[PDB]
PDB file of C-alpha atoms and ligand atoms in Angstrom:
ATOM      1  CA  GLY A   1      17.792  -2.293 -14.606  1.00  0.00           C
ATOM      2  CA  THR A   2      13.995  -1.387 -14.471  1.00  0.00           C
ATOM      3  CA  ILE A   3      12.732   2.004 -15.217  1.00  0.00           C
ATOM      4  CA  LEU A   4       8.948   2.856 -14.830  1.00  0.00           C
ATOM      5  CA  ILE A   5       7.323   5.353 -17.447  1.00  0.00           C
ATOM      6  CA  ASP A   6       4.225   7.128 -16.073  1.00  0.00           C
ATOM      7  CA  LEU A   7       1.517   7.155 -18.999  1.00  0.00           C
ATOM      8  CA  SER A   8      -0.799  10.249 -18.975  1.00  0.00           C
ATOM      9  CA  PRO A   9      -4.425   9.726 -18.503  1.00  0.00           C
ATOM     10  CA  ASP A  10      -4.778  11.342 -21.871  1.00  0.00           C
ATOM     11  CA  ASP A  11      -2.524   8.395 -23.711  1.00  0.00           C
ATOM     12  CA  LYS A  12      -4.437   5.980 -25.434  1.00  0.00           C
ATOM     13  CA  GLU A  13      -2.328   3.170 -24.207  1.00  0.00           C
ATOM     14  CA  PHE A  14      -3.549   4.456 -20.393  1.00  0.00           C
ATOM     15  CA  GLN A  15      -6.855   4.209 -21.638  1.00  0.00           C
ATOM     16  CA  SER A  16      -6.916   0.957 -23.365  1.00  0.00           C
ATOM     17  CA  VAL A  17      -5.155  -0.577 -20.218  1.00  0.00           C
ATOM     18  CA  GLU A  18      -7.812   1.280 -18.065  1.00  0.00           C
ATOM     19  CA  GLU A  19     -10.522  -0.385 -20.153  1.00  0.00           C
ATOM     20  CA  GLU A  20      -9.114  -4.025 -19.663  1.00  0.00           C
ATOM     21  CA  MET A  21      -8.723  -3.418 -16.042  1.00  0.00           C
ATOM     22  CA  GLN A  22     -12.316  -2.185 -15.586  1.00  0.00           C
ATOM     23  CA  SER A  23     -14.475  -4.147 -18.131  1.00  0.00           C
ATOM     24  CA  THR A  24     -13.447  -7.450 -16.686  1.00  0.00           C
ATOM     25  CA  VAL A  25     -14.145  -7.110 -12.937  1.00  0.00           C
ATOM     26  CA  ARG A  26     -16.724  -9.585 -11.991  1.00  0.00           C
ATOM     27  CA  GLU A  27     -18.528 -10.834  -9.050  1.00  0.00           C
ATOM     28  CA  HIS A  28     -16.746 -13.894  -7.290  1.00  0.00           C
ATOM     29  CA  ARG A  29     -18.261 -16.968  -5.240  1.00  0.00           C
ATOM     30  CA  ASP A  30     -16.465 -15.922  -2.090  1.00  0.00           C
ATOM     31  CA  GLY A  31     -18.928 -12.960  -1.970  1.00  0.00           C
ATOM     32  CA  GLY A  32     -15.831 -10.497  -1.500  1.00  0.00           C
ATOM     33  CA  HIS A  33     -13.769 -12.362   1.081  1.00  0.00           C
ATOM     34  CA  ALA A  34     -10.597 -12.596  -0.712  1.00  0.00           C
ATOM     35  CA  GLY A  35     -10.335  -9.299  -2.763  1.00  0.00           C
ATOM     36  CA  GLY A  36     -12.977  -7.344  -1.261  1.00  0.00           C
ATOM     37  CA  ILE A  37     -16.746  -5.701  -2.750  1.00  0.00           C
ATOM     38  CA  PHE A  38     -16.396  -3.587  -5.570  1.00  0.00           C
ATOM     39  CA  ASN A  39     -17.678  -3.300  -8.927  1.00  0.00           C
ATOM     40  CA  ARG A  40     -14.963  -0.968 -10.234  1.00  0.00           C
ATOM     41  CA  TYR A  41     -11.848   0.317  -9.342  1.00  0.00           C
ATOM     42  CA  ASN A  42     -10.235   3.845  -8.966  1.00  0.00           C
ATOM     43  CA  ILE A  43      -7.352   3.941 -11.223  1.00  0.00           C
ATOM     44  CA  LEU A  44      -4.625   5.812  -9.487  1.00  0.00           C
ATOM     45  CA  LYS A  45      -1.460   5.676 -11.913  1.00  0.00           C
ATOM     46  CA  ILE A  46      -0.467   3.115 -14.964  1.00  0.00           C
ATOM     47  CA  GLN A  47       2.918   2.993 -15.485  1.00  0.00           C
ATOM     48  CA  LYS A  48       5.271   1.140 -18.429  1.00  0.00           C
ATOM     49  CA  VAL A  49       7.784  -1.555 -17.149  1.00  0.00           C
ATOM     50  CA  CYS A  50      11.065  -0.874 -19.032  1.00  0.00           C
ATOM     51  CA  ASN A  51      14.057  -3.551 -18.609  1.00  0.00           C
ATOM     52  CA  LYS A  52      15.818  -4.173 -21.512  1.00  0.00           C
ATOM     53  CA  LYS A  53      17.510  -7.626 -20.187  1.00  0.00           C
ATOM     54  CA  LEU A  54      13.962  -9.062 -18.916  1.00  0.00           C
ATOM     55  CA  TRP A  55      12.379  -8.047 -22.233  1.00  0.00           C
ATOM     56  CA  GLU A  56      15.062 -10.139 -24.356  1.00  0.00           C
ATOM     57  CA  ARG A  57      14.779 -13.044 -22.028  1.00  0.00           C
ATOM     58  CA  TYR A  58      11.055 -13.071 -22.623  1.00  0.00           C
ATOM     59  CA  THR A  59      11.248 -12.404 -26.578  1.00  0.00           C
ATOM     60  CA  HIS A  60      14.200 -15.253 -26.794  1.00  0.00           C
ATOM     61  CA  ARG A  61      11.720 -17.767 -25.025  1.00  0.00           C
ATOM     62  CA  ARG A  62       8.845 -16.435 -26.944  1.00  0.00           C
ATOM     63  CA  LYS A  63      10.654 -17.247 -30.267  1.00  0.00           C
ATOM     64  CA  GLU A  64      11.470 -20.883 -28.897  1.00  0.00           C
ATOM     65  CA  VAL A  65       7.730 -21.685 -27.873  1.00  0.00           C
ATOM     66  CA  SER A  66       6.734 -20.143 -31.445  1.00  0.00           C
ATOM     67  CA  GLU A  67       8.908 -22.614 -33.271  1.00  0.00           C
ATOM     68  CA  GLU A  68       7.689 -25.494 -31.486  1.00  0.00           C
ATOM     69  CA  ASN A  69       3.941 -24.308 -32.351  1.00  0.00           C
ATOM     70  CA  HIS A  70       4.031 -23.672 -35.746  1.00  0.00           C
ATOM     71  CA  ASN A  71       5.140 -20.263 -35.377  1.00  0.00           C
ATOM     72  CA  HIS A  72       2.574 -19.195 -33.130  1.00  0.00           C
ATOM     73  CA  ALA A  73       3.530 -17.705 -29.620  1.00  0.00           C
ATOM     74  CA  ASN A  74      -0.243 -17.734 -28.582  1.00  0.00           C
ATOM     75  CA  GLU A  75       0.534 -14.680 -26.694  1.00  0.00           C
ATOM     76  CA  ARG A  76      -2.068 -13.061 -24.472  1.00  0.00           C
ATOM     77  CA  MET A  77      -2.274  -9.742 -22.073  1.00  0.00           C
ATOM     78  CA  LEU A  78      -3.415 -11.046 -18.669  1.00  0.00           C
ATOM     79  CA  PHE A  79      -3.252  -9.730 -15.054  1.00  0.00           C
ATOM     80  CA  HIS A  80      -1.206 -10.827 -12.374  1.00  0.00           C
ATOM     81  CA  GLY A  81      -2.022 -10.022  -8.687  1.00  0.00           C
ATOM     82  CA  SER A  82       1.103 -10.781  -6.456  1.00  0.00           C
ATOM     83  CA  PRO A  83       2.505 -10.072  -2.809  1.00  0.00           C
ATOM     84  CA  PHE A  84       5.763  -9.716  -5.064  1.00  0.00           C
ATOM     85  CA  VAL A  85       4.873  -6.968  -7.546  1.00  0.00           C
ATOM     86  CA  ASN A  86       8.200  -5.205  -6.742  1.00  0.00           C
ATOM     87  CA  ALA A  87      10.413  -8.282  -6.716  1.00  0.00           C
ATOM     88  CA  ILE A  88       8.747  -9.044 -10.108  1.00  0.00           C
ATOM     89  CA  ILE A  89       9.432  -5.753 -12.077  1.00  0.00           C
ATOM     90  CA  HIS A  90      12.873  -5.716 -11.019  1.00  0.00           C
ATOM     91  CA  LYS A  91      14.006  -9.278 -11.134  1.00  0.00           C
ATOM     92  CA  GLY A  92      11.401 -10.638 -13.654  1.00  0.00           C
ATOM     93  CA  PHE A  93       9.196 -13.623 -12.888  1.00  0.00           C
ATOM     94  CA  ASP A  94      10.773 -16.910 -11.747  1.00  0.00           C
ATOM     95  CA  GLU A  95      10.132 -19.884  -9.303  1.00  0.00           C
ATOM     96  CA  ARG A  96       9.758 -17.684  -6.213  1.00  0.00           C
ATOM     97  CA  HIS A  97       6.608 -16.224  -7.796  1.00  0.00           C
ATOM     98  CA  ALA A  98       4.951 -19.395  -8.222  1.00  0.00           C
ATOM     99  CA  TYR A  99       1.641 -20.596  -6.500  1.00  0.00           C
ATOM    100  CA  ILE A 100       2.639 -23.993  -5.242  1.00  0.00           C
ATOM    101  CA  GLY A 101      -0.851 -24.690  -3.905  1.00  0.00           C
ATOM    102  CA  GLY A 102      -2.750 -23.936  -7.336  1.00  0.00           C
ATOM    103  CA  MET A 103      -5.361 -26.031  -8.703  1.00  0.00           C
ATOM    104  CA  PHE A 104      -3.296 -26.752 -11.860  1.00  0.00           C
ATOM    105  CA  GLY A 105       0.019 -27.350 -10.030  1.00  0.00           C
ATOM    106  CA  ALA A 106       2.953 -25.273  -8.902  1.00  0.00           C
ATOM    107  CA  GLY A 107       3.356 -22.471 -11.722  1.00  0.00           C
ATOM    108  CA  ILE A 108       2.789 -18.746 -12.191  1.00  0.00           C
ATOM    109  CA  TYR A 109      -0.962 -17.821 -12.616  1.00  0.00           C
ATOM    110  CA  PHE A 110      -2.505 -15.251 -14.705  1.00  0.00           C
ATOM    111  CA  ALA A 111      -6.448 -14.426 -15.101  1.00  0.00           C
ATOM    112  CA  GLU A 112      -8.213 -12.658 -17.537  1.00  0.00           C
ATOM    113  CA  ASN A 113     -10.373 -11.064 -15.000  1.00  0.00           C
ATOM    114  CA  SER A 114      -8.560  -8.503 -13.396  1.00  0.00           C
ATOM    115  CA  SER A 115     -10.791  -9.206 -10.056  1.00  0.00           C
ATOM    116  CA  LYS A 116      -9.493 -12.819 -10.127  1.00  0.00           C
ATOM    117  CA  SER A 117      -5.651 -11.292  -9.732  1.00  0.00           C
ATOM    118  CA  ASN A 118      -7.190  -8.682  -7.074  1.00  0.00           C
ATOM    119  CA  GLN A 119      -7.810 -11.251  -4.951  1.00  0.00           C
ATOM    120  CA  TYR A 120      -4.238 -12.297  -4.668  1.00  0.00           C
ATOM    121  CA  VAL A 121      -2.752  -9.002  -4.071  1.00  0.00           C
ATOM    122  CA  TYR A 122      -2.434  -9.160  -0.233  1.00  0.00           C
ATOM    123  CA  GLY A 123      -1.670 -12.947  -0.730  1.00  0.00           C
ATOM    124  CA  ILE A 124      -3.109 -16.370  -1.316  1.00  0.00           C
ATOM    125  CA  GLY A 125      -6.840 -16.205  -0.259  1.00  0.00           C
ATOM    126  CA  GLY A 126      -6.057 -12.150   0.208  1.00  0.00           C
ATOM    127  CA  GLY A 127      -4.170 -12.902   3.375  1.00  0.00           C
ATOM    128  CA  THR A 128      -4.704 -10.589   5.987  1.00  0.00           C
ATOM    129  CA  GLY A 129      -5.836  -7.763   4.085  1.00  0.00           C
ATOM    130  CA  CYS A 130      -3.795  -4.702   3.459  1.00  0.00           C
ATOM    131  CA  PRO A 131      -0.953  -4.085   5.768  1.00  0.00           C
ATOM    132  CA  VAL A 132      -2.239  -0.967   7.396  1.00  0.00           C
ATOM    133  CA  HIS A 133      -5.887  -1.866   8.373  1.00  0.00           C
ATOM    134  CA  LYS A 134      -5.795  -5.639   8.084  1.00  0.00           C
ATOM    135  CA  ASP A 135      -8.739  -5.101   5.833  1.00  0.00           C
ATOM    136  CA  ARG A 136      -9.333  -7.715   2.717  1.00  0.00           C
ATOM    137  CA  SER A 137     -11.782  -5.191   1.454  1.00  0.00           C
ATOM    138  CA  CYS A 138      -9.965  -1.558   2.239  1.00  0.00           C
ATOM    139  CA  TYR A 139     -11.124   1.117   0.115  1.00  0.00           C
ATOM    140  CA  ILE A 140      -8.322   3.538   1.294  1.00  0.00           C
ATOM    141  CA  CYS A 141      -4.877   1.621   0.582  1.00  0.00           C
ATOM    142  CA  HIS A 142      -3.247   1.529  -2.517  1.00  0.00           C
ATOM    143  CA  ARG A 143      -2.807  -1.672  -4.515  1.00  0.00           C
ATOM    144  CA  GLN A 144      -1.125  -2.929  -7.220  1.00  0.00           C
ATOM    145  CA  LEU A 145      -1.527  -5.415 -10.358  1.00  0.00           C
ATOM    146  CA  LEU A 146       0.153  -6.249 -13.209  1.00  0.00           C
ATOM    147  CA  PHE A 147      -0.760  -6.488 -16.687  1.00  0.00           C
ATOM    148  CA  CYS A 148       1.550  -8.962 -18.328  1.00  0.00           C
ATOM    149  CA  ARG A 149       2.418 -10.251 -21.725  1.00  0.00           C
ATOM    150  CA  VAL A 150       2.235 -14.042 -21.265  1.00  0.00           C
ATOM    151  CA  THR A 151       3.568 -16.812 -24.003  1.00  0.00           C
ATOM    152  CA  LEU A 152       1.032 -19.640 -23.647  1.00  0.00           C
ATOM    153  CA  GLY A 153       2.012 -21.668 -26.520  1.00  0.00           C
ATOM    154  CA  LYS A 154       0.358 -24.949 -26.984  1.00  0.00           C
ATOM    155  CA  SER A 155      -1.842 -25.002 -23.936  1.00  0.00           C
ATOM    156  CA  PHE A 156      -3.372 -27.838 -21.904  1.00  0.00           C
ATOM    157  CA  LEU A 157      -7.191 -27.423 -21.686  1.00  0.00           C
ATOM    158  CA  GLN A 158      -8.425 -28.119 -18.058  1.00  0.00           C
ATOM    159  CA  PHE A 159     -12.379 -27.831 -17.910  1.00  0.00           C
ATOM    160  CA  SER A 160     -13.006 -27.227 -14.120  1.00  0.00           C
ATOM    161  CA  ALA A 161     -14.930 -25.969 -11.519  1.00  0.00           C
ATOM    162  CA  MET A 162       8.050 -25.531  -9.788  1.00  0.00           C
ATOM    163  CA  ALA A 163       6.133 -28.269 -11.860  1.00  0.00           C
ATOM    164  CA  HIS A 164       6.835 -28.826 -15.493  1.00  0.00           C
ATOM    165  CA  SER A 165       4.002 -28.142 -18.366  1.00  0.00           C
ATOM    166  CA  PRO A 166       2.318 -31.398 -19.674  1.00  0.00           C
ATOM    167  CA  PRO A 167       4.326 -33.165 -21.873  1.00  0.00           C
ATOM    168  CA  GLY A 168       3.806 -31.362 -25.420  1.00  0.00           C
ATOM    169  CA  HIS A 169       2.445 -28.323 -24.117  1.00  0.00           C
ATOM    170  CA  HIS A 170       4.036 -24.893 -22.967  1.00  0.00           C
ATOM    171  CA  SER A 171       1.130 -23.638 -20.102  1.00  0.00           C
ATOM    172  CA  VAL A 172      -2.218 -24.726 -18.780  1.00  0.00           C
ATOM    173  CA  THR A 173      -5.527 -23.410 -19.392  1.00  0.00           C
ATOM    174  CA  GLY A 174      -8.291 -23.429 -16.573  1.00  0.00           C
ATOM    175  CA  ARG A 175     -11.706 -23.045 -18.345  1.00  0.00           C
ATOM    176  CA  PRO A 176     -14.436 -21.972 -16.081  1.00  0.00           C
ATOM    177  CA  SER A 177     -17.009 -24.802 -16.220  1.00  0.00           C
ATOM    178  CA  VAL A 178     -19.451 -23.898 -13.568  1.00  0.00           C
ATOM    179  CA  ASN A 179     -19.677 -19.982 -13.209  1.00  0.00           C
ATOM    180  CA  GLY A 180     -20.809 -18.962 -16.934  1.00  0.00           C
ATOM    181  CA  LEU A 181     -19.725 -15.519 -16.212  1.00  0.00           C
ATOM    182  CA  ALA A 182     -15.737 -16.571 -15.066  1.00  0.00           C
ATOM    183  CA  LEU A 183     -13.136 -15.889 -17.590  1.00  0.00           C
ATOM    184  CA  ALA A 184     -10.151 -18.258 -17.874  1.00  0.00           C
ATOM    185  CA  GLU A 185      -6.881 -18.542 -15.743  1.00  0.00           C
ATOM    186  CA  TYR A 186      -3.601 -19.393 -17.552  1.00  0.00           C
ATOM    187  CA  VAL A 187      -0.616 -21.127 -15.754  1.00  0.00           C
ATOM    188  CA  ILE A 188       3.010 -20.886 -16.975  1.00  0.00           C
ATOM    189  CA  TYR A 189       5.982 -23.069 -15.559  1.00  0.00           C
ATOM    190  CA  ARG A 190       8.731 -21.023 -16.782  1.00  0.00           C
ATOM    191  CA  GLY A 191       9.369 -17.083 -15.472  1.00  0.00           C
ATOM    192  CA  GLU A 192      10.634 -16.220 -19.130  1.00  0.00           C
ATOM    193  CA  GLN A 193       7.125 -16.985 -20.519  1.00  0.00           C
ATOM    194  CA  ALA A 194       5.972 -13.441 -19.050  1.00  0.00           C
ATOM    195  CA  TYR A 195       6.880 -10.040 -19.217  1.00  0.00           C
ATOM    196  CA  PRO A 196       5.632  -7.570 -16.213  1.00  0.00           C
ATOM    197  CA  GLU A 197       4.542  -4.636 -19.055  1.00  0.00           C
ATOM    198  CA  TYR A 198       2.052  -2.225 -16.993  1.00  0.00           C
ATOM    199  CA  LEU A 199       2.199  -1.624 -12.977  1.00  0.00           C
ATOM    200  CA  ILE A 200      -1.072  -0.432 -12.277  1.00  0.00           C
ATOM    201  CA  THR A 201      -2.016   1.503  -9.017  1.00  0.00           C
ATOM    202  CA  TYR A 202      -5.337   1.673  -7.907  1.00  0.00           C
ATOM    203  CA  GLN A 203      -8.085   1.233  -5.490  1.00  0.00           C
ATOM    204  CA  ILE A 204     -11.085  -0.896  -5.115  1.00  0.00           C
ATOM    205  CA  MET A 205     -14.461   1.400  -4.900  1.00  0.00           C
ATOM    206  CA  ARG A 206     -16.792   1.043  -2.470  1.00  0.00           C
ATOM    207  CA  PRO A 207     -20.412   0.391  -4.315  1.00  0.00           C
ATOM    208  CA  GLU A 208     -23.120   2.731  -3.839  1.00  0.00           C
TER     209      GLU A 208
HETATM  210  O1  25F B 301      -3.055 -13.270 -10.262  1.00  0.00           O
HETATM  211  C1  25F B 301      -3.024 -14.507  -9.996  1.00  0.00           C
HETATM  212  N1  25F B 301      -1.949 -14.309  -9.005  1.00  0.00           N
HETATM  213  C2  25F B 301      -1.954 -15.302  -8.222  1.00  0.00           C
HETATM  214  C3  25F B 301      -0.796 -15.546  -7.135  1.00  0.00           C
HETATM  215  C4  25F B 301      -0.978 -16.704  -6.081  1.00  0.00           C
HETATM  216  C5  25F B 301      -0.061 -16.968  -5.148  1.00  0.00           C
HETATM  217  C6  25F B 301       1.271 -16.259  -5.167  1.00  0.00           C
HETATM  218 BR1  25F B 301       2.297 -16.364  -3.711  1.00  0.00          BR
HETATM  219  C7  25F B 301       1.365 -15.052  -5.802  1.00  0.00           C
HETATM  220  C8  25F B 301       0.368 -14.949  -6.962  1.00  0.00           C
HETATM  221  N2  25F B 301      -2.651 -16.709  -8.459  1.00  0.00           N
HETATM  222  C9  25F B 301      -3.600 -16.608  -9.491  1.00  0.00           C
HETATM  223  C10 25F B 301      -4.573 -17.937  -9.605  1.00  0.00           C
HETATM  224  C11 25F B 301      -5.476 -17.569 -10.625  1.00  0.00           C
HETATM  225  C12 25F B 301      -5.647 -16.108 -11.350  1.00  0.00           C
HETATM  226  C13 25F B 301      -4.832 -15.167 -11.377  1.00  0.00           C
HETATM  227  C14 25F B 301      -3.936 -15.274 -10.306  1.00  0.00           C
HETATM  228 ZN1   ZN B 302      -5.785  -0.421   4.253  1.00  0.00          ZN
END
């Protein structure tokens, strides 16, 4: 059911997606251990992910959340990095894409910082890095992130340094409470609350 449509770099939609990728890079407390050392990316391709059935599954659930929250879905566009990006774009998000050991419990994790989602592209903690060179900071191999439409509804605010939502909430927000430069991370507990709208193929760039 999934088709991928390439965006032209001249397309304003390519440009606005690239800009959210680039402008949400930050330094990480592991010194680049999980995701590598870089201040920016080389964007190779941006594709729109089109699947009617998965879209309708998303919008069905979005309406449900919206009616439970004074007609406010509290929809965001957020990054997701995963070893399973290929399964996700073809079959949707579900429990097999959950971060069982995540700090806000077993759910599907998203980030405002593209560089945070980058840390998960090759697995939790970056795994063993790229399959070809075993390098978590590989500047050669092609990486992929998803830029996703995510329904948060009523989000439980956790201040801080698969399962269910907390009662009366549709998601969890992990608010950064130590690293003043960190953006928020979010967790949903239902695959139907995200749609993987853009597939972004890129390299991290070695700083000069
Ligand atoms: O973008 C993410 N991805 C994952 C992730 C974790 C485990 C697996 Br298996 C697959 C993906 N965790 C995150 C945790 C916090 C913020 C962003 C992310
Ligand atoms: Zn490599």
